[PDB]
Design a protein around this motif. Structure first.
Motif, PDB file in Angstrom:
ATOM      1  N   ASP A 101       1.929  -7.554  -8.133  1.00 64.91           N
ATOM      2  CA  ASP A 101       1.891  -6.110  -8.333  1.00 64.91           C
ATOM      3  C   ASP A 101       2.032  -5.366  -7.007  1.00 64.91           C
ATOM      4  OD1 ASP A 101      -0.240  -3.693  -8.095  1.00 64.91           O
ATOM      5  OD2 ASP A 101       0.733  -3.578 -10.056  1.00 64.91           O
ATOM      6  N   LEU A 102       1.331  -5.834  -5.969  1.00 66.64           N
ATOM      7  CA  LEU A 102       1.474  -5.259  -4.637  1.00 66.64           C
ATOM      8  C   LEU A 102       2.927  -5.264  -4.184  1.00 66.64           C
ATOM      9  CD1 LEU A 102      -1.567  -6.724  -2.656  1.00 66.64           C
ATOM     10  CD2 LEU A 102      -1.153  -4.319  -3.205  1.00 66.64           C
ATOM     11  N   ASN A 103       3.640  -6.363  -4.440  1.00 69.63           N
ATOM     12  CA  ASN A 103       5.034  -6.455  -4.027  1.00 69.63           C
ATOM     13  C   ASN A 103       5.926  -5.534  -4.843  1.00 69.63           C
ATOM     14  OD1 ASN A 103       5.005  -9.975  -3.072  1.00 69.63           O
ATOM     15  ND2 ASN A 103       4.877  -8.112  -1.810  1.00 69.63           N
ATOM     16  N   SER A 104       5.546  -5.237  -6.089  1.00 75.80           N
ATOM     17  CA  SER A 104       6.294  -4.265  -6.879  1.00 75.80           C
ATOM     18  C   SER A 104       6.141  -2.844  -6.342  1.00 75.80           C
ATOM     19  CB  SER A 104       5.845  -4.298  -8.338  1.00 75.80           C
ATOM     20  OG  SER A 104       4.552  -3.723  -8.449  1.00 75.80           O
ATOM     21  N   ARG A 105       5.121  -2.588  -5.520  1.00 79.99           N
ATOM     22  CA  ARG A 105       4.903  -1.289  -4.893  1.00 79.99           C
ATOM     23  C   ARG A 105       5.508  -1.211  -3.500  1.00 79.99           C
ATOM     24  NH1 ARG A 105       0.174   0.920  -7.758  1.00 79.99           N
ATOM     25  NH2 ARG A 105      -0.359  -0.679  -9.310  1.00 79.99           N
ATOM     26  N   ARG A 106       6.515  -2.030  -3.212  1.00 80.50           N
ATOM     27  CA  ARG A 106       7.076  -2.157  -1.870  1.00 80.50           C
ATOM     28  C   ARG A 106       6.030  -2.607  -0.853  1.00 80.50           C
ATOM     29  NH1 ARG A 106       8.834   2.453   0.345  1.00 80.50           N
ATOM     30  NH2 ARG A 106       8.240   4.048  -1.195  1.00 80.50           N
ATOM     31  N   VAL A 140      -9.247 -12.831   0.468  1.00 77.68           N
ATOM     32  CA  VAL A 140      -9.041 -11.532   1.091  1.00 77.68           C
ATOM     33  C   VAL A 140      -7.552 -11.390   1.375  1.00 77.68           C
ATOM     34  CG1 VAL A 140      -9.834  -9.965   2.852  1.00 77.68           C
ATOM     35  CG2 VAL A 140     -11.294 -11.860   2.119  1.00 77.68           C
ATOM     36  N   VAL A 141      -6.880 -10.545   0.601  1.00 79.39           N
ATOM     37  CA  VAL A 141      -5.459 -10.246   0.765  1.00 79.39           C
ATOM     38  C   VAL A 141      -5.315  -8.967   1.573  1.00 79.39           C
ATOM     39  CG1 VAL A 141      -3.287  -9.927  -0.439  1.00 79.39           C
ATOM     40  CG2 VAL A 141      -5.100 -11.307  -1.473  1.00 79.39           C
ATOM     41  N   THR A 142      -4.580  -9.038   2.678  1.00 78.25           N
ATOM     42  CA  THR A 142      -4.289  -7.867   3.494  1.00 78.25           C
ATOM     43  C   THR A 142      -2.808  -7.532   3.407  1.00 78.25           C
ATOM     44  OG1 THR A 142      -6.099  -8.105   5.068  1.00 78.25           O
ATOM     45  CG2 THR A 142      -4.121  -6.922   5.795  1.00 78.25           C
ATOM     46  N   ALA A 143      -2.508  -6.288   3.030  1.00 78.61           N
ATOM     47  CA  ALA A 143      -1.140  -5.868   2.785  1.00 78.61           C
ATOM     48  C   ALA A 143      -0.906  -4.494   3.400  1.00 78.61           C
ATOM     49  CB  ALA A 143      -0.832  -5.852   1.279  1.00 78.61           C
ATOM     50  N   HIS A 144       0.369  -4.202   3.661  1.00 78.19           N
ATOM     51  CA  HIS A 144       0.848  -2.865   4.007  1.00 78.19           C
ATOM     52  C   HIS A 144       1.601  -2.316   2.808  1.00 78.19           C
ATOM     53  CE1 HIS A 144       0.821  -3.838   8.592  1.00 78.19           C
ATOM     54  NE2 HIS A 144      -0.382  -3.583   8.112  1.00 78.19           N
ATOM     55  N   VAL A 145       1.127  -1.199   2.266  1.00 75.17           N
ATOM     56  CA  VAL A 145       1.753  -0.607   1.087  1.00 75.17           C
ATOM     57  C   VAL A 145       1.951   0.884   1.353  1.00 75.17           C
ATOM     58  CG1 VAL A 145       1.693  -0.482  -1.439  1.00 75.17           C
ATOM     59  CG2 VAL A 145       0.426  -2.300  -0.245  1.00 75.17           C
ATOM     60  N   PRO A 146       3.073   1.468   0.950  1.00 72.27           N
ATOM     61  CA  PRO A 146       3.253   2.913   1.168  1.00 72.27           C
ATOM     62  C   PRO A 146       2.326   3.711   0.265  1.00 72.27           C
ATOM     63  CG  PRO A 146       5.200   1.937   0.134  1.00 72.27           C
ATOM     64  CD  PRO A 146       4.321   0.797   0.556  1.00 72.27           C
ATOM     65  N   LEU A 147       1.615   4.670   0.868  1.00 73.02           N
ATOM     66  CA  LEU A 147       0.691   5.507   0.113  1.00 73.02           C
ATOM     67  C   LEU A 147       1.316   6.015  -1.177  1.00 73.02           C
ATOM     68  CD1 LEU A 147      -2.184   6.923   0.173  1.00 73.02           C
ATOM     69  CD2 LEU A 147      -0.825   8.964   0.772  1.00 73.02           C
ATOM     70  N   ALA A 148       2.599   6.369  -1.130  1.00 64.06           N
ATOM     71  CA  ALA A 148       3.283   6.899  -2.303  1.00 64.06           C
ATOM     72  C   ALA A 148       3.268   5.933  -3.481  1.00 64.06           C
ATOM     73  CB  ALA A 148       4.726   7.260  -1.941  1.00 64.06           C
ATOM     74  N   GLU A 149       3.149   4.631  -3.231  1.00 64.98           N
ATOM     75  CA  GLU A 149       3.142   3.642  -4.297  1.00 64.98           C
ATOM     76  C   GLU A 149       1.739   3.163  -4.651  1.00 64.98           C
ATOM     77  OE1 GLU A 149       5.788   2.742  -5.967  1.00 64.98           O
ATOM     78  OE2 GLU A 149       7.310   3.746  -4.745  1.00 64.98           O
TER      79      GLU A 149
END
Length: 635
Positions: free
Chosen positions: A568-573, A587-596
């Motif tokens: 799901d995280l990857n579907s949000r770019r 513990v998953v650490t990701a960079h996701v655009p606020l818009a997504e």
């Protein structure tokens, strides 16, 4: 030493009389923190409930307390709400004990609940108690340290373990000892050689194990029928850490920005963290602080190192079960409330002037989410300003602006939801809120010079993306420099600063670029008109590009959901940065655009049956993809 006698604790309970009520009654014979006494210890009970889902407040609660009592519903077992807090406590290795409550209610199953603590939470459980009697017959506990039963009549008393429980009691005695002797080789040889291990010996290893988070002592009882509270108090004093045991508070030395472990000590410079601001009609606004070093007396001058503003200690108060105490001095380890502070917010650090430290790193990111506000009628405009500003001081990560329609700016949905609610409710402000807007930005990719003439003043300016400049001594988003024909250099800055808010692509503020004023001409005054034209025309020549806020997302999930969560995280770019096993969780650490990320709280819940949790802070700006860049130039 006074410091070793302190116990700073939270009681983490999903509100069922409650356990904490019983605790407060037994020490004497609403508050952000309550101070009481048991045996020879001073216990400071931090109120852990708050927003309860804001994340920031939960972590700040966990740094103020030093140990915790996790309270589990004896009938329900381990619930999503309790799992998620237990995971956050794992983050900080908080020394913890479990209190299995409501042992008198229909369906109360101590052993099922212990199994869930071991299974669902992956916690290494140290069972130091067994329940005596099921449901309505629950009458007390077997203390496995003393190997004795404690019974409550309706008065209480300690007796030999009941006959029908001597098998269970003797078997758990061993399981305890096998767990406890793993922390020492000498006593291990003493227990292996056959010698009896003393109660004082067992209590010491249990304490060491509890303080090092090697295991969690399990207790039980019934706060309703008033059974088991005294042993829990004893175990709190005996097993949960003092501030000495914690040893250090983490923070930053202000003059050097160097992160440091600060020793907890009265002879070191004063430092404290404010964790709750509470309004009182009799004494005004109270700022609750946990002191980690040094001392303050009434009348001292300290400095708020987040605001970089001085404060004067006036009234200081200790909250007890049902009375406040004015005190003239407080010191390392104490939790006290200060009155009449000028400009201190929760999360702020109060420090000695001679040595300034910050204990909760408080980068103030440019706001990522923006909301349009219109007051209902022309009248409320007075209330609409005084309320939004009274809250922007209590919270610095919130901003309000005005266009010569007022606009509020925050760091996330729930953050703004809470503010709008306190705006209408607590402050009786009637207004209309627009829909959120992502705070996009704009930058240039390449260097571009332009000689611009207005008529009559003319500037010649070079624009450079900061990533390519060859200078520096600081780190601003917009840099000015003038290697100059005119003494009007201040006039160019004002123009350039005013217009960069209005970027060349689609109206968003231009950021991350230098502007070098090289050469010029003159014949009047007000060069801002020309500098604006330079910017307005020049910046189209630096290949400008739209920018979106990227959030650092940290998801703590049990392994079975991580495949879904990561998909799901990857579907949000999103882009995953790291995974680290913590206990039986990841513990998953990701960079996701606020818009997504809108509504992620509810998506994560439905993807993990409520057992995952997440936190989100601003990471960085980077360029937007083609499809969204067109979606932004639409408006």
């Amino acid at each position: 030493n006074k410091l070793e006698q302190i116990r700073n604790i939270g009681i983490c309970a999903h509100i069922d009389t409650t356990t904490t009520e019983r605790i407060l009654y037994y020490t004497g014979k609403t508050s952000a923190a309550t101070t009481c006494r048991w045996q020879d210890k001073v216990i400071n009970i931090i109120d852990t409930p708050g927003h309860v889902d804001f994340t920031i407040e939960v972590e700040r609660s966990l740094r103020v307390l030093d140990g915790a009592v996790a309270v589990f519903d004896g009938v329900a077992g381990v619930e999503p709400q309790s799992e998620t807090v237990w995971r956050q406590a794992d983050k900080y290795n908080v020394p913890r004990m479990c209190f299995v409550n409501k042992m008198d209610r229909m369906g109360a199953d101590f052993y099922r609940c212990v199994e869930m603590i071991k299974d669902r939470l992956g916690a290494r459980s140290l069972i130091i108690q067994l329940p005596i009697g099921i449901e309505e017959n629950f009458k007390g506990i077997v203390n496995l340290i003393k190997m004795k039963a404690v019974i409550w009549k309706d008065e209480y008393f300690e007796e030999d373990i009941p006959a029908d429980m001597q098998d269970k009691a003797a078997e758990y005695r061993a399981r305890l000892l096998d767990m406890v002797v793993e922390l020492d080789d000498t006593i291990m040889e003493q227990y292996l050689s056959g010698a009896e291990i003393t109660e004082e010996q067992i209590k010491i290893l249990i304490r060491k194990g509890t303080i090092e988070a090697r295991f969690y002592p399990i207790l039980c009882g019934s706060a309703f029928k008033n059974k088991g509270v005294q042993p829990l108090l004893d175990a709190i004093v005996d097993f949960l850490p003092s501030p000495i045991d914690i040893g250090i508070v983490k923070g930053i030395e202000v003059s050097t920005s160097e992160e440091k472990d600060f020793p907890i000590s009265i002879v070191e410079p004063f430092s404290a963290l404010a964790f709750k601001i509470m309004n009182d009609p009799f004494v005004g606004s109270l700022t609750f602080i946990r002191i980690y070093s040094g001392k303050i007396t009434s009348g001292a001058t300290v400095i708020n190192t987040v605001k970089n503003k001085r404060e004067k200690i006036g009234r200081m108060l200790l909250m007890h079960a049902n009375n406040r105490e004015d005190i003239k001095e407080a010191s390392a380890g104490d939790i006290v409330a200060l009155a009449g502070l000028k400009d201190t917010s929760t999360g702020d650090t109060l420090s000695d002037i001679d040595k300034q430290v910050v204990l909760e790193r408080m980068e103030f990111p440019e706001p990522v989410i923006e909301l349009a506000v219109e007051p209902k009628s022309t009248a409320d405009q007075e209330k609409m300003g005084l309320a939004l500003s009274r809250l922007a001081a209590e919270d610095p990560s919130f901003r309000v602006s005005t266009d010569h329609q007022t606009v509020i700016k925050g760091m996330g949905e729930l953050h703004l939801e809470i503010i709008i609610d306190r705006m209408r409710r607590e402050f009786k402000v009637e207004a209309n809120i627009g829909a959120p807007q992502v705070a996009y930005r704009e930058t240039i990719t390449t260097a571009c010079e332009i000689d611009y003439t207005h008529k009559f003043a003319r500037v010649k300016i070079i624009f450079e993306p900061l990533k390519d400049v060859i200078d520096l001594d600081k780190n601003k988003t917009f840099v000015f420099e003038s290697k100059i024909p005119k003494e009007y250099i201040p006039g160019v800055e004002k123009g350039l600063n005013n217009i960069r808010e209005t970027g060349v692509i689609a109206g968003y503020p231009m950021i991350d670029f230098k502007a070098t004023l090289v050469d010029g001409a003159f014949h009047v005054l007000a060069f801002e008109i020309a500098a604006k034209g330079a910017f307005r025309e020049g910046m189209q020549k630096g290949n400008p590009k739209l920018l979106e806020p990227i959030m650092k997302v940290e998801v703590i999930t049990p392994d079975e959901y991580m495949g879904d969560i990561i998909g799901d995280l990857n579907s949000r770019r999103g882009q995953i940065q790291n995974m680290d096993p913590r206990g039986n969780a990841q513990v998953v650490t990701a960079h996701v655009p606020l818009a997504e990320m809108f509504g992620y709280v509810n998506t994560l819940r439905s993807l993990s049956q409520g057992r995952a949790q997440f936190s989100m802070i601003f990471s960085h700006y980077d360029q937007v993809p083609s499809q969204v860049a067109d979606m932004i130039k639409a408006k």
